[PDB]
Design a protein around this nucleic acid. Sequence first.
DNA 1: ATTATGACGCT
DNA 2: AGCGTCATA
Length: 430
Amino acid sequence: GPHMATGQDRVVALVDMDCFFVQVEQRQNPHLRNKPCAVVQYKSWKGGGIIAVSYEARAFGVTRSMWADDAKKLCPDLLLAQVRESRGKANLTKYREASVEVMEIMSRFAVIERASIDEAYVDLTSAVQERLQKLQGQPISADLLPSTYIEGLPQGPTVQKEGMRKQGLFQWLDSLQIDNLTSPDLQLTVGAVIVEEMRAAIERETGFQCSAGISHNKVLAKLACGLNKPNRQTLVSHGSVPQLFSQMPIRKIRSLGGKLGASVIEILGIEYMGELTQFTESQLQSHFGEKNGSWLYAMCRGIEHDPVKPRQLPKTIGCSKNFPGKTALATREQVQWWLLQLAQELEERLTKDRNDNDRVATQLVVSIRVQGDKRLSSLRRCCALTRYDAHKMSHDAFTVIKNCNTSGIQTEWSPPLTMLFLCATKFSAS
DNA sequence: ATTATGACGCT
DNA sequence: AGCGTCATA
Ligand SMILES: [Ca+2]
Ligand SMILES: [Mg+2]
């Protein structure tokens, strides 16, 4: 009744750069702009592996994870940009630096949580209150929301995309109660005005475009963001939830895309998020555990309480390289040489991190995969990280893994190694 | 022979 | 701690 929480206490946005690595390359090379293009890493094996795809290329069916040779079969005029190679491996520095550009702009508007290289959650609750005070009961013009979609509208009693967008928006604004500074729908609307402003600033100052979701929590924000891409933003209101979830496959919800989501579907015999409402919280907790059960019970009603964490910097800095099929490392000299390459990239990134961010990593995590193991990682071991020195780190890493060598010969490595990983963690202020 | 990342949960 | 899950370019 009057005591039933509705999860409308916050305004949260998720901003996500459109085909990010592609835009980075297109900014640098104007010849790639407005073309079907992709970003690829390496090149020898089947033309390279695609990691990002422009919307023009996606129309031909080009996807992430596709080999470039195969992509060219779908899209013969596909243009490509290659990821930089340093010390024998892919080097993502250019994209990490572009990311900082965007995050520093978003941080001017609100506290952000860096969710990935190209997305951040924004807690707009306080900013919306402020903006609402400046507004003085004054209505919000459709003009302040030029790229906004209202999920669920238009409805009820134009055949062009942009025209539908506007019809929906008009219905929404026609129905807003603006004299009420606590209306959740109004709050979301003002949130969308601010995100329009954030997105304009990002584009003006970087050249990069993005999409965004505006809702009452991170999960709905994230879902909303993907509803209208690219270069658009979507408002998912509390009210839109029942209809949106009634046909929303469970795997679409963040955290439900893997094994848990599959078990929810299998155990409960349902397909869609909204079907979850028919189970009690205790039923859900019985199948999926106490925490997941409570989470699912609230989430299928559009309610979620995870905070936007005040964190703009990554918590770890890592370097990894796969050594697939025949290239697997089978000698001690090999393993040592590659540990050094990885350690050298890591030292470089750690030193920059210390100068920029006033912190020092204190733990080195070492991880390898051995040929045969189905798991991505076969073994993880940590040691102390007392000095930013690549020779030291690679030596320490070899020490912690050197006994994974089954070989009776000192110089041979069996089973061969198909992945090496160095990660610096546990930062302290400096 | 996707690859290179990065966060957080479990015991 | 070391392992597994889930996610993104
Ligand atoms: Ca993106
Ligand atoms: Mg993303």
